[PDB]
Design a protein around this ligand. Structure first.
Ligand SMILES: Cc1ncc(COP(=O)(O)O)c(C=O)c1O
Ligand SMILES: Cc1ncc(COP(=O)(O)O)c(C=O)c1O
Ligand code: FES
Lengths: 135, 378, 377
């Protein structure tokens, strides 16, 4: 069990789909998730999420998108599984893969946004070559 | 609103009253040869007869164990080992509780041949597999009376005819005792598994009933209590409690199950109005206390936790609530891994009211809608 | 006047006060992923820790059982079956409870070589036999901490030293918890058995402490609770009571022990001052609660039922009361002639024993013995 995890699960932040989204990132069990971002001046002007999965899936997706909202892109790529696990107040083992879920959907969204706006160079910059290939 | 009765049950106040004096004033040990132990023995003996009486078990013996799990271990390992000189083939149902399925898997490591009996879309065993795979060397066949996950009642009377006294018949009655009639001669059982808590007695006790003549090797070795079949000083207070629960279930089971059926049906008729919902297990040959529904596009643990935050207790067969594998029962029915994720299991009991249901049916549809609206899958 | 505390003890009232809510209010199953599961889950873990704290059990794991009996079955069978490839040689004390002697005998049947450690006149295991017979292929030694029958305390500190890295050490601590200090690191236990009822918690639950990185095969198979070593839905209330009793035994034993030693002593001085009385087991290195003398001039069950009639609940090693009709294995092992041993009295003292209880037995016993040997063949 976990504390503020209940609050993000029951009252989730930024649920929805984004029409003409600027970047759409999507990811063994039964957890599937996508993140949608609109980007204005290198910022996340908006973020909405859709996930199917356990209570921790819901919670992390919520937290992750709350963490990224209004942040620069380089500021967002700083949202690892742990900055979100910690953000909530941690999670128990076995359910921790669900934090990796959210942090990955967000990375992919960001990586989507670069691959669409010819910013393939920044993809390299920047640490995220491996995740483009595995997509 | 507690709709998770098949994972735990409260102890009936009248059972507790029967139990308490054995824990503090008449705490004697049945093996003792003095007043304190004699009282102790009368009490165990009375309890034994109330449990036997509950299942029409006069032509056989009750052996007190620590629960249905041990009882099952003992039924399967106890019986096969002692009887291996007469063959080593065994039939077991694919939807049995893991306290049957794992012991059969142990015998598989000890030169026993075990075949698992397939089931159909609603979870009933295939009787013609049994009749087709029965051999002169088959010594044991283990099938449950009813299934506690999908609610489905099994063709045990039918199964008993086919076997025709050519192989011993084990029946786990964990889900049935209290819901439907459990008569060992009517269902032709040679061994019967009973759970105390499932009939509202203390946890941590149960019995295996054994037809006269069926001979077994023990599993718990030591003092030779339970006539050598289960060692350890007898847990008198629990046994008494278990006995008091049997007496209550005998007197009250019929009216209780008729009431729970009526509530079961109101649930199923209302739950199933929800876009894309499906009943698992048989729609009629089904325990009065079982609703198992699934919901497309969403995951079971989420439904379960949502419910809880409303004050509603329930259960799921989703992978997410274990291991990390879905329910072996659901797989056997032939659910895909996708289908099994959105599972909701609501099981009814003695302290449920129409108001519990009211509450459930005004809360659920909002839950299914809230989750669906976030599912990438909708 | 209940002097049969080692056969069965009453549950302590505070233990009871802590058990009830979990039977009626908080009756949930720890596997459930909802609030009732969560409470039950916190309730179980807190007990597990209170039990670990009892025997100093941090470097290990507590596994809940239905009692000592099962815990010994798990210790011997589960440890030997899982470790057999390291060797198949086993050392078992000749005065262990039958819940250790029977599974070993199961093992002999399964090809394992089991040797039984002899004892001297006071039923004390021969630490020398353990030195010279411990082979390269020895994997398990089983020695009880104390004997509930005759009271003798085994040399477990010194046995643990005879070993050192070689074979795992099983210690049945049923007799000893609440009586004398029980510390897993000090006695060097690789496994340790604990009985709830024996420490005023409920009947029907007990435990096996198991040192970190000792590996066992489970006995009870199924749902995977107790981390795969003992399946079945947790008896939450019993486990709570067990923890509660663990918490009182930590906070009360030193004193209750003194009180009883005193009572035992009084009993010791007077019974021994009777026609043909011998004291079985060690007179000094002995549990605060064990008086067990034998009489040449009589039979045991007689002395027992003759006491019951005065209002005295006692016990006997007399063959008469054994359903198999054989006399105590524990006593034969000491060296007693089946005849000498027939008329023995055993008196387990406990929490609710007072001075007046003790003064009754001393005002009753002498006649019971005299107006009974007065009719002897
Ligand atoms: C040393 C010892 N071990 C094991 C046991 C078994 O306890 P139980 O019969 O409650 O499992 C006893 C008491 O009977 C005992 O004295
Ligand atoms: C069909 C069936 N058999 C056996 C059991 C074993 O129950 P316990 O965990 O109380 O031993 C259960 C669960 O209650 C069950 O549903
Ligand atoms: S279940 Fe993949 Fe949280």
């Amino acid at each position: 069990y976990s504390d503020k995890v209940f609050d993000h699960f029951q009252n989730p932040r930024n649920v929805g789909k984004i029409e003409d989204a600027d970047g759409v990132g999507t990811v063994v069990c039964g957890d599937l998730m996508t993140i949608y971002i609109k980007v204005k001046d290198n910022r996340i002007e908006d973020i909405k999420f859709q996930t199917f999965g356990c209570a921790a899936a819901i919670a992390t997706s919520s937290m992750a998108t709350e963490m990224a909202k209004g942040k620069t892109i380089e500021e967002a790529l700083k949202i690892t599984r742990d900055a979100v696990a910690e953000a909530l107040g941690g999670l128990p083992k076995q359910k921790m893969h669900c934090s990796n879920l959210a942090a990955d959907a967000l990375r992919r969204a960001i990586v989507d946004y670069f691959r669409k706006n010819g910013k393939i160079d920044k993809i390299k910059e920047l640490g995220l070559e491996k995740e483009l290939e595995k997509m | 609103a507690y709709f998770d009765y098949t994972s735990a049950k409260p102890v009936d106040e009248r059972i507790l009253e029967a139990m308490l004096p054995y824990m503090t004033e008449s705490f004697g040990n049945p093996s003792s040869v003095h007043s304190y132990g004699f009282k102790a023995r009368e009490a165990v003996q009375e309890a034994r007869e109330k449990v036997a009486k509950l299942v029409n078990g006069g032509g056989g013996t009750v052996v007190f164990t620590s629960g249905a799990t041990e009882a099952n271990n003992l039924a399967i390992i106890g019986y096969a080992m002692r009887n291996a000189r007469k063959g080593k083939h065994i039939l077991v149902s694919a939807v049995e509780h893991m306290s049957v399925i794992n012991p059969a898997k142990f015998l598989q490591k000890q030169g026993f041949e075990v075949e698992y009996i397939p089931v159909g879309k609603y979870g009933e065993v295939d009787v013609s597999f049994i009749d087709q795979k029965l051999r002169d060397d088959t010594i044991l066949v283990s099938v449950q009376h009813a299934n506690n996950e999908i609610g489905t009642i099994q063709p045990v009377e039918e199964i008993s005819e086919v076997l025709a006294g050519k192989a011993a018949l084990h029946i786990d009655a964990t889900a049935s005792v209290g819901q439907i009639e459990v008569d060992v001669e009517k269902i032709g059982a040679d061994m019967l598994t009973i759970s105390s808590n499932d009939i509202y007695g203390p946890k941590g006790v149960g019995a295996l009933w054994i037809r006269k003549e069926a001979k077994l090797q023990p599993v718990i070795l030591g003092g030779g209590q339970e006539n050598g079949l289960r060692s350890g000083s007898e847990n008198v207070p629990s046994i008494v409690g278990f006995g008091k629960a049997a007496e209550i279930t005998a007197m009250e089971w019929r009216e209780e199950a008729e009431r729970l059926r009526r509530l079961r049906d109101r649930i199923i008729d209302n739950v199933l109005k929800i876009e894309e919902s499906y009943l698992n297990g048989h729609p009629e040959k089904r325990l009065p206390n079982n609703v198992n529904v699934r919901f497309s596009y969403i995951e079971g643990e989420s439904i379960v936790l949502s419910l809880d935050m409303a004050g509603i207790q329930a259960s799921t067969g989703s992978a997410c609530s274990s291991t990390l594998q879905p329910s072996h029962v659901l797989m056997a029915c032939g659910l895909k891994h996708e289908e099994a994720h959105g599972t909701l299991l609501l099981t009814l009991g003695r302290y449920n009211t129409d108001e519990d249901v009211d509450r459930l049916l005004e809360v659920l549809p909002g839950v299914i809608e809230r989750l669906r609206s976030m599912s990438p899958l909708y």
